[PDB]
Amino acid sequence: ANLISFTFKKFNETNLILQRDATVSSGKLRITKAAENGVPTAGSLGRAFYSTPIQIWDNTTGTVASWATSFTFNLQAPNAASPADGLAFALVPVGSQPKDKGGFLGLFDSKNYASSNQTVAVEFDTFYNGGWDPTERHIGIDVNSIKSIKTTSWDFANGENAEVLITYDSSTNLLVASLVHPSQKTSFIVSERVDLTSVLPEWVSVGFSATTGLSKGYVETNEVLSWSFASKLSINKEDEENKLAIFNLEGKA
Amino acid sequence: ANLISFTFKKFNETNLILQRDATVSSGKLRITKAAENGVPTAGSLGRAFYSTPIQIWDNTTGTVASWATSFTFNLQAPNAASPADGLAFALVPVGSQPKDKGGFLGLFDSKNYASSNQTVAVEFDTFYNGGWDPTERHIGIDVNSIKSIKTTSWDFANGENAEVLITYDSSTNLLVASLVHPSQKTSFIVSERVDLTSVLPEWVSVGFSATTGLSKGYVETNEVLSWSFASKLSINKENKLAIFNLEGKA
Amino acid sequence: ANLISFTFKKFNETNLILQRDATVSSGKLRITKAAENGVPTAGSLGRAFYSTPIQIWDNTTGTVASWATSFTFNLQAPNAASPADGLAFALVPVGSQPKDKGGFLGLFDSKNYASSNQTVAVEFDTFYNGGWDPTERHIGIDVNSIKSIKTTSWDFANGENAEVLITYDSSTNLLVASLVHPSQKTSFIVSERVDLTSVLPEWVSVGFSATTGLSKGYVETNEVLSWSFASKLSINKENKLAIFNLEGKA
Amino acid sequence: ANLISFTFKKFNETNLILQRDATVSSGKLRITKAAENGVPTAGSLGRAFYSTPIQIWDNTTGTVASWATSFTFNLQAPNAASPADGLAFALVPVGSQPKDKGGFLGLFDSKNYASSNQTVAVEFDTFYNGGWDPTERHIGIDVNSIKSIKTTSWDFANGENAEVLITYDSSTNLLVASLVHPSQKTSFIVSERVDLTSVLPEWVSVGFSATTGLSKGYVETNEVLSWSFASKLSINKEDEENKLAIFNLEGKA
Numbered sequence A, D: 001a002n003l004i005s006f007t008f009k010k011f012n013e014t015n016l017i018l019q020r021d022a023t024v025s026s027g028k029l030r031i032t033k034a035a036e037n038g039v040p041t042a043g044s045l046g047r048a049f050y051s052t053p054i055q056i057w058d059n060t061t062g063t064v065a066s067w068a069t070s071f072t073f074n075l076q077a078p079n080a081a082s083p084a085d086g087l088a089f090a091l092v093p094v095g096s097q098p099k100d101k102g103g104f105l106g107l108f109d110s111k112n113y114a115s116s117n118q119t120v121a122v123e124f125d126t127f128y129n130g131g132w133d134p135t136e137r138h139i140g141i142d143v144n145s146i147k148s149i150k151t152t153s154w155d156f157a158n159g160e161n162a163e164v165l166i167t168y169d170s171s172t173n174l175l176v177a178s179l180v181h182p183s184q185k186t187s188f189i190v191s192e193r194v195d196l197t198s199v200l201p202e203w204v205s206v207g208f209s210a211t212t213g214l215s216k217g218y219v220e221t222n223e224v225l226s227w228s229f230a231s232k233l234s235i236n237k238e239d240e241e242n243k244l245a246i247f248n249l250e251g252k253a
Numbered sequence B, C: 001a002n003l004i005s006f007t008f009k010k011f012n013e014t015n016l017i018l019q020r021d022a023t024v025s026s027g028k029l030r031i032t033k034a035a036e037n038g039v040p041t042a043g044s045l046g047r048a049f050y051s052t053p054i055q056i057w058d059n060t061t062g063t064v065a066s067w068a069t070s071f072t073f074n075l076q077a078p079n080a081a082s083p084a085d086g087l088a089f090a091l092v093p094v095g096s097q098p099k100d101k102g103g104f105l106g107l108f109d110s111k112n113y114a115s116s117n118q119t120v121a122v123e124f125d126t127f128y129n130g131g132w133d134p135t136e137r138h139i140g141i142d143v144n145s146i147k148s149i150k151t152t153s154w155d156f157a158n159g160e161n162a163e164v165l166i167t168y169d170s171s172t173n174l175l176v177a178s179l180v181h182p183s184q185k186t187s188f189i190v191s192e193r194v195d196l197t198s199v200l201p202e203w204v205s206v207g208f209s210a211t212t213g214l215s216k217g218y219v220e221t222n223e224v225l226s227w228s229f230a231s232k233l234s235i236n237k238e239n240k241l242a243i244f245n246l247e248g249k250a
């Protein structure tokens, strides 16, 4: 079985694919631009991916990979009544380019079924777009669209750390995403079956995508403070389930 | 830092401390009793704990361990009109013997706070008990009491595999517990701060405890199919959750 | 796939089975007697094992487990001219007791292959017993016999740390034991095809056994400073070695 | 602790960098341009590497990283009297190109010490030069030059499957390289302490540097069956050893 793993408790530029306004400042993945005075800037778009393409399914064997990612992010808005737009963990083609800004989070073009994009994303959305979004702040699973196929409620804590875990079991074809705010003892979880064989390509770039608002006032920081990732691809049998107990302790702590 | 980890994708009697009715049958941990034909027995208790004691906190240095556990369990009742009582993952003292059965889940004696227990449990309760339980099915965090300090609703599906992950971050004192039913794509989560230095002893045994109903009809199978665990205790002054569920569970 | 892993950097008395003179003090595992002055004592015998039994071959599935260990040991002798006897990493029946004191290392009875004991050991010999030992200080593989099945020449560095790595694979069966002395920048390696189904029972306890001289001036310390171990039993019909050494090594 | 690891049991081109005369195909890693008939070509330079650069030491803390690797590499030559030249586990800089062919192993320009090369490699020599080499076959460490300071003796097994383990410890600066034969039992080991903060830079491309001779007579093949790697960076003045037992079972075993 082929495996690929990494742990970034501190960020570096050389092993990441930085796109647009994404930059590594003082060990922190600052996806959206900030001023030298500490002010978030509007109309920003940033993308950061791992330098190694990751195999999530094989053509010649028909086997799906089991993979898991963890990360801690912090979204800091000067005003909590005017934030936009949010950040996402995405899997995208090897040389895929940034798309529409703002509510599309640099990942999608529209709310309809766009199979050509070939992108699966777990979004952490802090702006109500109406055209697709639920009423309050939410975590969503995005399949070839910004209109999430499933969502859950996210009681967002302004400027507090958010510890995330995203797991995909190939045998049950289930994508599970959870968010905990350690400062407020709050917990949130999403789970939905997604088949990666027909949605995503064999090789993908794994990383982050974030935007700010299309208006001057709707601004936030979109920093990623830590990020661990693991994947296991089976040889011939469908797949064996991954180990999650030793995943978060060796990576997140 | 000292580490301790294991993965039980198939169970063995040799490396577990079996208590009461808990037994290993065809590589699957049956915590409560069941007939050769497949029907669960009423009024049963079982406990299964790992062989080596795990250090959660060191008194002299003050350092507290970060740990994570993943397991898949199967609760199957002949009739959903009468299910009892439930199963729990718990941390207990070294020489901990089974306590009161039934609603107390073999881990507690009374509804009031008793420091003599020194038990931290994550319960997966399916029966609506008396002066301690919330209205529906629930996950709970038990601390020296059967009355959970915090609960979350859990839509339980009969005879369907539940994927559990429990995590304890030392630096933030946060105990998080999650349950996913992959068959119907349902997920549930709870999080609460627990001071394990005040509650647990320095060395603990980790594992399971389950009970069937005290009445003759209220019966269920309390099975655990897989179980992976890891712990990390520092030396002088977080755990990798990504690689945990893969190598072990995932 | 069943897994079991742990790493030591500082030792404790709770997560180990301690036999005879085996003592834990200041976080270091002292297998043989060291007086309240810092002086080693002759005639001492000790055994230290992990409290969890480890499966090395399963009968019903017909597969042999692949394991690996890594430990830093220090042999501090007041006189290099009279050193006895050494230490060994061993796989032994779960509740098995130490045997002959001295050159037999508290593991074996005689120089002949006796599979009533069922003990596989990797010795680090620092005394010349001659009847079964080569000329000088040596690292050997012991299978049911104190007379090693294979040995390699070992430049024993007195009072210096020795970082060992022992590996066993299922596909190749090549038991490979390597020792490095970082201070002297030296390295030595042993390799022989051993099959565990012919020797050890389904379940064993892994750990260490060390002895001092049968004389009165033959004194040395047999300390273990760190200890890692990982094992994997392949279900149905190769284990990683790189991702292990850094956990406890890298 | 910044972590990075991967285990190949089945190689792919999509996650492999190629330099000069490298090629990735047919269920193995043929580093040199081999013909259809299985013919070793002389006057070549193969270079296969992993996409992510790997950190050796930090600047903001000054902490050296411990790493470990394991691979099953093969050297096969028709004539026993003419083996040339071999391969080396290259830690070549990211922004660096291949150099001289032959006895230089595509790593260094001259036999003299030069800190501009910034490369440390584990040599697997087969040809007799002697100007910067011992009297026979040798496995050692190259420091800022093709000339070695300490090497071991090795029996050149003609086309034998051999599992290798190369490990590094930051605390004692020791590089331990072992080579075992599952069929022949001929095990060999070498270790030497060299400071890497003085020699190597922060980030390097990690893989294999392989070369052939100048004459058609002196030829051999270079193949890799399975390859594994792990690396750990310490945080604040640890000077500690990394786990080694948990790694070797992931790929090899």
Ligand SMILES: OC[C@H]1O[C@@H](O)[C@H](O)[C@@H](O)[C@H]1O
Binding pocket: A084, A085, A101, A102, A103, A104, A127, A129, A212, A213, A214, A215, A218
């Ligand atoms: O007010 C901020 C908003 O501006 C809108 O034009 C845009 O569609 C949203 O995504 C958000 O950026």
Ligand SMILES: OC[C@H]1O[C@@H](O)[C@H](O)[C@@H](O)[C@H]1O
Binding pocket: B084, B085, B102, B103, B104, B127, B129, B212, B213, B214, B215, B218
């Ligand atoms: O009907 C079965 C029930 O019986 C009660 O007496 C008991 O408190 C419950 O735990 C449950 O076992």
Ligand SMILES: OC[C@H]1O[C@@H](O)[C@H](O)[C@@H](O)[C@H]1O
Binding pocket: C084, C085, C101, C102, C103, C104, C127, C129, C212, C213, C214, C215, C218
């Ligand atoms: O000098 C000490 C020695 O004494 C011998 O009689 C014995 O055979 C050796 O094992 C060693 O203990």
Ligand SMILES: OC[C@H]1O[C@@H](O)[C@H](O)[C@@H](O)[C@H]1O
Binding pocket: D084, D085, D101, D102, D103, D104, D127, D212, D213, D214, D215, D218
């Ligand atoms: O005979 C072949 C040899 O040719 C030499 O000129 C060269 O220095 C050696 O590396 C080797 O290739």
Ligand SMILES: [Ca+2]
Binding pocket: A085, A103, A125, A126, A127, A128, A129, A133
């Ligand atoms: Ca939105």
Ligand SMILES: [Ca+2]
Binding pocket: B085, B103, B125, B126, B127, B128, B129, B133
């Ligand atoms: Ca109850």
Ligand SMILES: [Ca+2]
Binding pocket: C085, C103, C125, C126, C127, C128, C129, C133
């Ligand atoms: Ca001897």
Ligand SMILES: [Ca+2]
Binding pocket: D102, D103, D104, D125, D127, D128, D129, D133
């Ligand atoms: Ca040469």
Ligand SMILES: [Mn+2]
Binding pocket: A123, A125, A132, A133, A134, A138, A140, A146, A148
């Ligand atoms: Mn949305």
Ligand SMILES: [Mn+2]
Binding pocket: B123, B125, B132, B133, B134, B138, B140, B146, B148
């Ligand atoms: Mn309850």
Ligand SMILES: [Mn+2]
Binding pocket: C123, C125, C132, C133, C134, C138, C140, C146, C148
């Ligand atoms: Mn001997």
Ligand SMILES: [Mn+2]
Binding pocket: D123, D125, D132, D133, D146, D148
């Ligand atoms: Mn050379």
